[PDB]
Amino acid sequence: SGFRKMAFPSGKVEGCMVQVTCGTTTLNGLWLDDVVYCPRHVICNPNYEDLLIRKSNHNFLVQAGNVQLRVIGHSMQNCVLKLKVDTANPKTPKYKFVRIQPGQTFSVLACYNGSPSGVYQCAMRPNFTIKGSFLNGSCGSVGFNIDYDCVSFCYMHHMELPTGVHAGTDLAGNFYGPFVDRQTAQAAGTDTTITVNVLAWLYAAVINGDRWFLNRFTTTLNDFNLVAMKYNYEPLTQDHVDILGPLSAQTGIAVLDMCASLKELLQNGMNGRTILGSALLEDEFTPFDVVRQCSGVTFQ
Amino acid sequence: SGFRKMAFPSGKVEGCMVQVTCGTTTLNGLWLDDVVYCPRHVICNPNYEDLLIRKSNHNFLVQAGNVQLRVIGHSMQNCVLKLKVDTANPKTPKYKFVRIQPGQTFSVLACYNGSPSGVYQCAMRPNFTIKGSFLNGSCGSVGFNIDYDCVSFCYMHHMELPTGVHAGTDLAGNFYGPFVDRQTAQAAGTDTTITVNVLAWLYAAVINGDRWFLNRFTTTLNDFNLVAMKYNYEPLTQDHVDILGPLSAQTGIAVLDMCASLKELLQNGMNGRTILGSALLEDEFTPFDVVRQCSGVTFQ
Numbered sequence A, B: 001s002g003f004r005k006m007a008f009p010s011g012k013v014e015g016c017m018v019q020v021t022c023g024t025t026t027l028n029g030l031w032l033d034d035v036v037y038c039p040r041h042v043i044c045n046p047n048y049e050d051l052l053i054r055k056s057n058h059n060f061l062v063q064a065g066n067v068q069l070r071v072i073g074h075s076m077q078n079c080v081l082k083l084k085v086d087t088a089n090p091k092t093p094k095y096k097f098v099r100i101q102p103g104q105t106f107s108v109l110a111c112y113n114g115s116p117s118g119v120y121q122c123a124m125r126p127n128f129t130i131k132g133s134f135l136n137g138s139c140g141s142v143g144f145n146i147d148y149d150c151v152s153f154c155y156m157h158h159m160e161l162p163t164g165v166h167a168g169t170d171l172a173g174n175f176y177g178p179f180v181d182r183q184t185a186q187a188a189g190t191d192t193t194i195t196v197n198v199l200a201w202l203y204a205a206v207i208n209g210d211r212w213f214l215n216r217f218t219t220t221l222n223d224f225n226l227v228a229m230k231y232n233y234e235p236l237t238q239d240h241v242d243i244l245g246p247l248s249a250q251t252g253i254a255v256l257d258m259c260a261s262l263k264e265l266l267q268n269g270m271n272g273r274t275i276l277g278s279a280l281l282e283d284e285f286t287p288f289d290v291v292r293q294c295s296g297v298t299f300q
């Protein structure tokens, strides 16, 4: 039993973390096969096209540990630089590039100067920021999920917002959210609480013997969503309810019943009590998260 | 900026996770060099000596993925079984066996059937339990810290306590805490809050722009420790204060001043406000944790 924020094993990803240096900028790059993906502002209100047409191959330094990789070509796909080198990465896994929806989670392998520093779990917030742990030097660390043997790369860090959250891109270059890799006024946008995730975590709670929050009451998804509005919670769809099925099945608590509990928590608070060792309703646990952790799915 | 519970990169440890099967028991083993460390109750109020004198080499199945390892010898060092095999692990890192003190943290690579499932961060509580995330099949997963290039293995899981926390051993076999690998009445013992860690996390808070908890007041380590008693907090030693130095230095907040803040939080609570996104005073962050994360120390 027990329930922790759990990263995926970071090992298949460490094998791909290289250093990318160009001029006075050093950040992290992701070497997959013979291509090194890094954030394009390594070439730095700029005009990266003009700034790239503009460099030569030999301007790009690529350390892979103690091995210097020669770039034999480069392109720019949206906000990522794709530096083609002359060595395929022997440690290249089975991998996907995917793009996540807000609500969903992934593992971040914070790197600096190409060396892995740590791994933790994040969520794509509603406002498309991620509450991360990024310092100067971190740019080019990747978010990712592991599926059997497949790494789904879904994030590259680029930048931090004045509120201390972070913004970045899928590995095909495209910013999650309205942000841009230009140092100009950009505001996160009001965040909301991922309701489907909070229920999943309440299910994680029941599965682990935590029952202090339950009640006999039920509610209809409509009038629950009236109170999820006021508490600035994501409306719950029936599609969220379907997903919650397995968890509702395991525990014999109807998804709607759990909503009536979450309702009452929002209307009263937790009153000195914790759930799964938090005094907050936690929302960076997808339902799939709970099932993985409350059933121990592995990866070879 | 930002601040997360951050595991070490789990890659050097994944390389060592093998499956160990004996009779009707399958758990996880740690293959380092030509020796496979696993929990001794894989041979199962027993008498493991009688139970071991007792098996032969060929009784022990050792999968390393799709490669079956032959045991050529076995011994029992305290509560761990050391199965000598005929193949040294090509992926063996620089590593230590160490034993941690209560208060300190490490990364746990939850494995099942030899395959890594996830990685999260733990603390050795005061009562020498760890609040983990362990299911049937998990036994033999290891806790560990990474130091430059060196893995300090400090934990192997053996068992869960009726309260849902976990107990285990250093890799030399010895139970942290009064627990024993016998299914008999064993109680955790009252837990306490790791005060030195809570301050470190408050320092992590200041470093990240969180100041809502500070005040002009100071206190003497003596009369602080009077209130740390009542709130069931570890007494703070001057030695803890010395450790907090660097963090107190970075922020210009005297360790004692921070204690006066922690005092006031305990005497009032957080009053609807969070620190570093928690409504609880967090204590599984050592000072070294904060400095690593608030300065980005890596590992090659």
Ligand SMILES: *[C@](O)(C(=O)NCc1ccccc1)[C@H](C[C@@H]1CCNC1=O)NC(=O)[C@@H]1[C@@H]2[C@H](CN1C(=O)[C@@H](NC(=O)NC(C)(C)C)C(C)(C)C)C2(C)C
Residues within 6 Å of the ligand: A024, A025, A026, A027, A041, A044, A134, A135, A136, A137, A138, A139, A158, A159, A160, A161, A162, A166, A180, A181, A182, A183, A184, A185, A186, A187, B001
């Ligand atoms: C990232 O590039 C990095 O880690 N690089 C290290 C580096 C070495 C040598 C030369 C240059 C960079 C860096 C990561 C940031 C910094 C700390 N944590 C982070 O998330 N990104 C970065 O500096 C981006 C990059 C510039 C400005 N920038 C920022 O994140 C800005 N933030 C903003 O300006 N955001 C606004 C536009 C206000 C919304 C700060 C935080 C550095 C000021 C790009 C192109 C946006």
Ligand SMILES: *[C@](O)(C(=O)NCc1ccccc1)[C@H](C[C@@H]1CCNC1=O)NC(=O)[C@@H]1[C@@H]2[C@H](CN1C(=O)[C@@H](NC(=O)NC(C)(C)C)C(C)(C)C)C2(C)C
Residues within 6 Å of the ligand: A001, B024, B025, B026, B027, B041, B044, B134, B135, B136, B137, B138, B139, B158, B159, B160, B161, B162, B166, B180, B181, B182, B183, B184, B185, B186, B187
């Ligand atoms: C651990 O052995 C494991 O993961 N093995 C899987 C396995 C496969 C095939 C055959 C046997 C085991 C297992 C891990 C536990 C179970 C779920 N989470 C865990 O932490 N340990 C385990 O079962 C130990 C082992 C027996 C009893 N035991 C327990 O943890 C007990 N707990 C206690 O009995 N603890 C007391 C003594 C009450 C304080 C339970 C939880 C299974 C009942 C050993 C030798 C103690």
